[PDB]
Amino acid sequence: SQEDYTLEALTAAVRRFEESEDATTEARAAAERDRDYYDEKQWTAAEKAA
């Protein structure tokens, strides 16, 4: 009844959040890389170690 409806609503909200998080993983990574480049972090760990 009410418990089932609440569980379904919570599952729908969590699924919406997970869809938003996973569907934009590459875009988020690219934006974070751009922010790091703007923030003086322009060298990767491997290249810096080399």
Binding site: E8, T11, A12, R15, R16, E18, E19, D22
Partner: protein, 52 residues
Amino acid sequence: DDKPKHRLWADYRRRRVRICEEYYLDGEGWKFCMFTKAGFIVPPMPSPYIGE
């Protein structure tokens, strides 16, 4: 096709559908249809929008 390609989840009830709204010039005048690949949504009727 839909954008973007996200993996389907069994517990997810969100479903995406595609509709086609077509205006075509028939022998008598403009007609407007709303359909899918399965069946009509709005049957072929004269366009409800009035021109010049």
